Structure formats: structure tokens, C-alpha cells
Design an enzyme around this catalytic site. Structure first.
Site, PDB file in Angstrom:
ATOM      1  CG  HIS A 113      23.855  77.888 -49.619  1.00 34.53           C
ATOM      2  ND1 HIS A 113      23.908  78.969 -48.774  1.00 34.53           N
ATOM      3  CD2 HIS A 113      25.144  77.409 -49.661  1.00 34.53           C
ATOM      4  CE1 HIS A 113      25.167  79.111 -48.348  1.00 34.53           C
ATOM      5  NE2 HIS A 113      25.945  78.183 -48.867  1.00 34.53           N
ATOM      6  CD  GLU A 173      32.062  75.553 -49.842  1.00 35.38           C
ATOM      7  OE1 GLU A 173      31.530  76.166 -48.901  1.00 35.38           O
ATOM      8  OE2 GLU A 173      32.304  76.129 -50.935  1.00 35.38           O
ATOM      9  CB  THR A 212      33.249  79.117 -49.452  1.00 40.95           C
ATOM     10  OG1 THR A 212      31.902  78.869 -49.904  1.00 40.95           O
ATOM     11  CG2 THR A 212      33.421  78.819 -47.983  1.00 40.95           C
ATOM     12  CB  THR A 213      30.684  82.159 -53.283  1.00 43.17           C
ATOM     13  OG1 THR A 213      29.921  82.851 -52.284  1.00 43.17           O
ATOM     14  CG2 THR A 213      30.239  80.759 -53.372  1.00 43.17           C
TER      15      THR A 213
HETATM   16 NI    NI Z   1      27.967  78.044 -48.522  1.00 42.94          NI
END
Ligand code: NI
EC number: 4.2.1.1
Length: 257
Positions: A91, A103, A195-196
Site C-alpha cells: 500500500h 510517514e 503506523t495504523t
Molecule cells: Ni503503511
């Protein structure tokens, strides 16, 4: 309960996921002058020749290109890794503007987007077990800058119209992820997290130094996606990046001098 808005964004996630304030959260800023070359690092082995892509899904926060991970078809090994890590999905994270979207940052620089190729350690048998381990995942991160088109991205861009909204999927067979890689495999690596939500501290991050170039038109197509489901009010899927987190007691290592 979570997303990227003012009311449900990164700054709120700790209420549901206290691990958000943990000791090895991602992403981080990569201070290139403070990273240290590590001669211990083994060479990086990306073995994607037998990859089997299956489907592309808008999951409400990004789109995932999913792979058959029931055999060793597309594997990552070497570098900082012990053992074999199987590709499950890739993704991207991207911005509303070309000046943000990544990010990780490099000396505080934000790229337009960041590609994540997500792999799980086969010693743990399945993804769901792997995310409960400190060495469960290996994520290969690749920065995107806007300039020339990336030819190997175009097949991804052109199916996005068919998965505009959350919960839509489309068949996506015969896609070769090798066409998304830069020339060099020089990298930085450190121990981090998803990171989610649920922000699990299960990831060995391997972030390539060399960005890939994508065109304005390609990134603009990312920005046409929606966070919402069909028939809900339209909210463009942009700025689906968590900002840099404190490094804490970690050292970023470089594979190169
Ligand atoms: Ni990611």
C-alpha cells in the site's frame, strides 16, 4: 473510531491504543548524519519472481494490493532479517499536496508518498500470529517523489476508479511488484511498529534510501480515492500518514556508507 481527521486522527489514537506512546513506535525521522553504517548487515534479498497478486482493496484508509502468501512465492530475506518473510500486501501513504505524504522523513524532509511492502515472518505461520511478535513483520519502505512517471505503477493507478470507496475490491492478478523498486537497495533499518491502529510493535523497518519518481498525474489519481463508503458523504483519501514519532532508545543503522 480512528482515521486521519481532526477528531479521530493520530493525536487521538492513544486513547484506544495506549501503545501509541510506546517505546518503539513508527514512523520516525531518519537523521542521516546520526544513522550509523553497520558492517554486520547481510545483503538484502528481494525474491519476487513467483509473486501472485490477487486483489486490490480500498480498506477505508489506503488501498492494499494483496498477494497469495500461502507459499514462499514473494519473499524478503537478508539485511537485518533472520529467516524468511512473505509478502502479504503493499500500500501507499500519500498527501493532499506534493510537499507531504510520507510517514518516514529524511532529515525532516517529507516526500509526496511512501510505498510499504508488508511481509510476515514464516516462523509464525500466519500474519495474525506474526503481528504479536517483536520480529513478526518486515516492511520495505520506498519514498515517492513527483517527477517522471513510474511505468510499473500505472496498472495500479488505472484500477483505482473501480475501488473508489471503502469496502470495494477488484481482481488484480499478474502484477509484478518489482516494477515499483528503485535501482539501489541501500537502506536504513530500525525496530518499530505498525503506523495504523493497533500500532503493534512488531515491525523491522527497512527504508530504502533511493526514492522512486511518479508523475503528477499518477499521484493525482491516488487523491481521487475516498475514505468513505459508497453513498456516504465524500471525503477524499489524502493525508493518510502518521507523523514521525519519538525515536526513544533506538539507533537507526545504515547498510551503506
Ligand atoms: Ni503503511
Amino acid at each position: 473510531h480512528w482515521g486521519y481527521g481532526k477528531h479521530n486522527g493520530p493525536e487521538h489514537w492513544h486513547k484506544d491504543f495506549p501503545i501509541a506512546k510506546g517505546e518503539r513506535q513508527s514512523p520516525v525521522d531518519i537523521d542521516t548524519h546520526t544513522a550509523k553504517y553497520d558492517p554486520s548487515l547481510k545483503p538484502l534479498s528481494v525474491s519476487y519472481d513467483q509473486a501472485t497478486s490477487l486483489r486490490i482493496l480500498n480498506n477505508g484508509h489506503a488501498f492494499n494490493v494483496e498477494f497469495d502468501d500461502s507459499q514462499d512465492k514473494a519473499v524478503l530475506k537478508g539485511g537485518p532479517l533472520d529467516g524468511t518473510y512473505r509478502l502479504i500486501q503493499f500500500h501507499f501513504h500519500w498527501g493532499s499536496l506534493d510537499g507531504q505524504g510520507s510517514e518516514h522523513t529524511v532529515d525532516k524532509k517529507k516526500y509526496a508518498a511512501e510505498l510499504h511492502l508488508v511481509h510476515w515472518n514464516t516462523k509464525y505461520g500466519d500474519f495474525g500470529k506474526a503481528v504479536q511478535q517483536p520480529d513478526g513483520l518486515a516492511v520495505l519502505g520506498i519514498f515517492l517523489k513527483v517527477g517522471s512517471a513510474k511505468p510499473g505503477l500505472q496498472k495500479v493507478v488505472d484500477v483505482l476508479d473501480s475501488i473508489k470507496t471503502k469496502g470495494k475490491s477488484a481482481d488484480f492478478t499478474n502484477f509484478d511488484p518489482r516494477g515499483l523498486l528503485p535501482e539501489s537497495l541501500d537502506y536504513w533499518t530500525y525496530p518499530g511498529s505498525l503506523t495504523t491502529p493497533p500500532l503493534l510493535e512488531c515491525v523491522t523497518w527497512i527504508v530504502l534510501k533511493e526514492p522512486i519518481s511518479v508523475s503528477s498525474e499518477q499521484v493525482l489519481k491516488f487523491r481521487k480515492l475516498n475514505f468513505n463508503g459508497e453513498g456516504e458523504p465524500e471525503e477524499l483519501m489524502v493525508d493518510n500518514w502518521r507523523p514521525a514519532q519519538p525515536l526513544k532508545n533506538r539507533q537507526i543503522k545504515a547498510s551503506f556508507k
